[PDB]
């Protein structure tokens, strides 16, 4: 069957077990079926992948893997040994087997080997044994498949895991030719689309890759991932992927925002898209409408609120990687126009103009009200009762509100170390606002 | 005696109780004595301050207040009712008293009333009873002082809490004149310096404020606060405050970084200063911190601290990379005695390598709690230096190539900041 769900596949602080249980609740609520465990910086997933879990760690994994079963979500355990492993040393191979067995005894029946972002060339001993980097990965992936008894679901993420990472192209890649041929027919292949973060995943691109790897891939979708930029959050709907892909694919797993509570939209809309033909804008409405209920006012026994419009504003400000939501783009166009047409100056060298200065002013007030809606959105969100949500999003909301606050001032006015060192180096690169509207 | 320690006084995710216990450990380890609880976004501290703590909330505060006593750290409970309180309605006043009693029964004997970020506002009904905003605040602050039995430590943070917030200046403020006169002698006054985030706290500025409020203030120090800027972290030493201030002050509480594990340097160096050379204090603190990791070297931490140093200053290795990159960009047009450009480019490209190395070893460390609290910030700097290294490379490879810097369709991280970033670029800052 078709895999649809979430991969916890991002860099940084991983999610905690209470959060993952709440995740399984939601995947079931929305009729998704899969979870792939692959947090890049849970140390025993990648950095110290040889190390067996301690007894108190094992108690938490088995408790987690059983919540997965309790909630009818399939649990796929991933391991990323590609960094420093010697493929031909059988102690390494045995260590990998030992590690998998251990998790299997916690009651896990599905697995994955990830070879994402790693040096293309092996050590000396390995070049001796294997003809290519591809051959080495397959050989151990197959061996491990078989050693585990050819389990229900088994995933392999290649080093050339998207269009732009294929040397020299997708169709003629010796690496992918080798995966297609030698990887055992029951092992599945993860693929992120044309790019690492794909704006669109066109059907023809999936036909093209499927030909060379001899099967339908499972999409690891980075569309809502935000690990690569401190300032970014993605609350927009699943988008750029035709429902026509579903027959051509073995699954879709989203790698979403690091901040757990910020993924309501990202996952609800994936679900909506799975069950459909699909309208991003309508899926967002469904998802925002449902999300609103999760934001209380606090209970009060002594005394002397977030709306749907607030959430719509918030999502349009923190939307998708290649697109702002309509209320965000509107405030942007309007502010550009105001700055451009600020010839309502006292030091005026066009005498004046009645009509053109009435328009500027009129549009400034209208804009100053839009800025108010941002401040209002922040105020009511900080007054909400679900603090877990407030905290997961606080810095992002504060930021936008403070900057809009300063933009409002600046427009009014028309009538320094910020970002820190990183900010200062950034301003000096001349591609700083190179994708701005 | 004299109050020195930490205020948990910032906006955002507050610290958790395990973190606060570990904090009390450290304050004692380093001979600090105080903690002020005032996280802006515990809902019952400020927004819904009338509300009593629930049973499960009360169980956690009692458990926390007793760890404070266990570790010989004084615990001061703050409350920020300034937003919507009616000062003249005695139900409001009673509600405030009810709330304080509740915390006292959790075993807490020290308190504070905060009136920080509030608009010089009275509702009517209040303007009827009280002649000014200042009069109204003191009247309830005094009443509450007395009602609690005039406790050991009691703090009052004024609305005019720093130089730039005093109308029209510090010396002639009717607001502060009124606080100085009518606030009872055993209540203390919190003050953040000339600014909200003070670069320096000069002695004369403290003499000046002490005169008008008729006592020595307790400094709420925002020097290492990072709640106001997503991209900023402060690992530099306590600085800009003369050791001559210590006799002129009733205390110093730092309001430090939101990310708990990032405050080792910020608090160790405060302690060192409480007994001064900033660069020697940093060395003491970085040397001690290195042990808590585990492979990460001292040179790695020195680089990291210099990259994320202080609000008005970068550390020497950071400022150096900056001046050198400015020079390279400025003098690129010559790509006769410009073997110096090339030479300086390679030398710079090696500096960028040390950043990548620092990040690599930090992600391989065994103290994951620390890694996570700082991960975003370290990734960011590494990615940006990585792109700076490229750009310098590209500048050099230009006598043999006329390719664009960005070649074709990019991944989103090439273009930083999102919508916030785009509005920022449109301001002149």
Residue numbers in the entry:
A (entry chain A): 59 to 334, 373 to 400, 552 to 662, 680 to 701
B (entry chain B): 59 to 333, 374 to 392, 552 to 592, 602 to 695
Question: What does the article say, verbatim?
Answer:
A structural overlay of OGAcryst-D175N in the substrate-free and substrate-bound states illustrated that substrate binding did not induce any changes in the dimeric structure of OGA.
OGA is the unique enzyme responsible for O-GlcNAc hydrolysis from a large number of cytoplasmic and nuclear proteins. Recently, our group and others have independently identified crystallizable constructs of OGA that comprise the catalytic domain and stalk domain, and published the apo form structures and enzyme complexes with active site inhibitors. These reports consistently showed that OGA formed an unusual arm-in-arm homodimer, where the catalytic domain of one monomer covered by the stalk domain of the sister monomer to create a potential substrate-binding cleft. Exploiting our previously reported construct of OGAcryst (residues 60–704 with the unstructured insert residues 401–552 replaced by a glycine–serine (GS) linker), we solved the structures of a mutant OGAcryst-D175N (catalytically impaired but retaining the ability to bind substrate) in apo form and in complex with each of four synthetic glycopeptides.
